[PDB]
Design an enzyme around this catalytic site. Sequence first.
Site, PDB file in Angstrom:
ATOM      1  N   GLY A 206     -15.624 -40.699  47.442  1.00 49.06           N
ATOM      2  CA  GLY A 206     -16.483 -41.794  47.042  1.00 49.06           C
ATOM      3  C   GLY A 206     -17.667 -41.952  47.965  1.00 49.06           C
ATOM      4  O   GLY A 206     -17.578 -41.795  49.148  1.00 49.06           O
ATOM      5  N   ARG A 221     -21.639 -32.211  52.950  1.00 45.53           N
ATOM      6  CA  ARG A 221     -22.132 -31.637  54.195  1.00 45.53           C
ATOM      7  C   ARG A 221     -21.538 -32.330  55.417  1.00 45.53           C
ATOM      8  O   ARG A 221     -21.117 -33.514  55.373  1.00 45.53           O
ATOM      9  CB  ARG A 221     -23.650 -31.782  54.286  1.00 45.53           C
ATOM     10  CG  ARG A 221     -24.440 -30.784  53.441  1.00 45.53           C
ATOM     11  CD  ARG A 221     -25.782 -31.416  52.896  1.00 45.53           C
ATOM     12  NE  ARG A 221     -25.459 -32.549  52.023  1.00 45.53           N
ATOM     13  CZ  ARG A 221     -26.208 -33.656  51.880  1.00 45.53           C
ATOM     14  NH1 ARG A 221     -27.361 -33.812  52.524  1.00 45.53           N
ATOM     15  NH2 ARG A 221     -25.783 -34.634  51.108  1.00 45.53           N
ATOM     16  N   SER A 243     -10.796 -43.867  48.359  1.00 49.71           N
ATOM     17  CA  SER A 243     -12.176 -43.397  48.194  1.00 49.71           C
ATOM     18  C   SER A 243     -13.057 -44.468  47.574  1.00 49.71           C
ATOM     19  O   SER A 243     -14.229 -44.557  47.858  1.00 49.71           O
ATOM     20  CB  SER A 243     -12.189 -42.179  47.287  1.00 49.71           C
ATOM     21  OG  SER A 243     -11.785 -41.064  48.081  1.00 49.71           O
ATOM     22  N   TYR A 246     -15.407 -46.724  49.621  1.00 47.47           N
ATOM     23  CA  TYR A 246     -16.681 -46.229  50.089  1.00 47.47           C
ATOM     24  C   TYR A 246     -17.757 -46.220  49.009  1.00 47.47           C
ATOM     25  O   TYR A 246     -18.896 -45.791  49.270  1.00 47.47           O
ATOM     26  CB  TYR A 246     -16.501 -44.849  50.741  1.00 47.47           C
ATOM     27  CG  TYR A 246     -15.445 -44.864  51.816  1.00 47.47           C
ATOM     28  CD1 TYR A 246     -15.784 -45.135  53.172  1.00 47.47           C
ATOM     29  CD2 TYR A 246     -14.122 -44.702  51.506  1.00 47.47           C
ATOM     30  CE1 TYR A 246     -14.848 -45.181  54.139  1.00 47.47           C
ATOM     31  CE2 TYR A 246     -13.132 -44.753  52.509  1.00 47.47           C
ATOM     32  CZ  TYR A 246     -13.520 -44.990  53.827  1.00 47.47           C
ATOM     33  OH  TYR A 246     -12.539 -45.041  54.798  1.00 47.47           O
ATOM     34  N   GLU A 335      -6.106 -39.387  54.782  1.00 52.94           N
ATOM     35  CA  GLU A 335      -7.479 -38.838  54.815  1.00 52.94           C
ATOM     36  C   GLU A 335      -7.349 -37.343  54.992  1.00 52.94           C
ATOM     37  O   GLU A 335      -6.672 -36.892  55.922  1.00 52.94           O
ATOM     38  CB  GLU A 335      -8.294 -39.462  55.938  1.00 52.94           C
ATOM     39  CG  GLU A 335      -8.245 -41.003  55.871  1.00 52.94           C
ATOM     40  CD  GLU A 335      -9.229 -41.695  56.790  1.00 52.94           C
ATOM     41  OE1 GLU A 335     -10.075 -41.062  57.417  1.00 52.94           O
ATOM     42  OE2 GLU A 335      -9.107 -42.922  56.901  1.00 52.94           O
TER      43      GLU A 335
END
Length: 353
Positions: A206, A221, A243, A246, A335
Amino acid sequence: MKRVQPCSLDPATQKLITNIFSKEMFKNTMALMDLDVKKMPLGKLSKQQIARGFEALEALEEALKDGGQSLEELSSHFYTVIPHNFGHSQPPPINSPELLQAKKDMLLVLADIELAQALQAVSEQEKTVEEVPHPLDRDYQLLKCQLQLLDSGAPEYKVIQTYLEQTGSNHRCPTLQHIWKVNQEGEEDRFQAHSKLGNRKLLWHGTNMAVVAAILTSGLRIMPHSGGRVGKGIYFASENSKSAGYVIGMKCGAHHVGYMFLGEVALGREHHINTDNPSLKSPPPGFDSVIARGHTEPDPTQDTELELDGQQVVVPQGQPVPCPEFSSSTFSQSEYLIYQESQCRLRYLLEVH
Ligand SMILES: C[C@H](NC(=O)CCc1nc2ccccc2c(=O)[nH]1)c1ccc(S(N)(=O)=O)cc1
């Protein structure tokens, strides 16, 4: 006078492209990050300014870890480089790790807003051609990313809906509006490097609406100043609810619109941790990923698989259940961390209300 060619995009895709390149969206995001949009308009944002902000945060970090400049003096320099708005009160001094990382994160988001502006710059070939694409076609083309809207009966559709529903919040689960298949080619070559690596899983990522264009252009990235509770890597979750925390969405009409990715992640041999380690820069030797294991995990007995580019990819389908071995973890929810951009390929983008 140039002809504007008719738009080739379906309605949902035109809406996506409108949203992820929206100037209001970008300025709203800057306001949500306490930036002064009057002093730092979108068109004025530059790579040099962003780089100078990171230099100022690097000086701050060194101060935080002598007779050097005070945190206030160094904060003041940062705030001159990157103008902030706190209703014309003084901005606050950057005097904790947490606040330092929050400013790094802000700049990482700002860097992707600048990327989207740079992408939109009109080329010289475009000034010479006598017909131009519809602006939403042009914007779609700039991503160099194939998007295909899925209908109800795409083979993976029910599997994805199930993943969202069973692992999303129990009380106010996000409502699925659209799914696109994502093909950012030449993620392809680097991803094929991990073809031998099994243990692939489809995982949630997210994000801010303001970075969706950049992600579609450049993939997920790892940048020099990225960090978090599991170090300097790309973060995913097996629970949509994690998620979704976020997702910075945007009010459109009566609803709140947000975007979430699904990435195929080649996890390989997993290193499990049960305590935060913000200093990690890779897995330990012989491991391909770090999983900060939560108190819960989507019930593994309900995992299914999809076949993507001829590889089996695990997709959770189960509600979260307790994992006794990690009942004392510092993580409520898992995570999943990779530390090489090549181990993730974007696969799906979801619009959720
Ligand atoms: C600051 C922002 N970070 C996020 O959006 C993190 C989003 C996120 N974090 C998770 C952490 C744990 C588990 C799941 C997630 C997740 O789904 N998203 C960010 C935005 C852009 C970039 S960039 N331009 O270097 O590629 C890096 C970082």
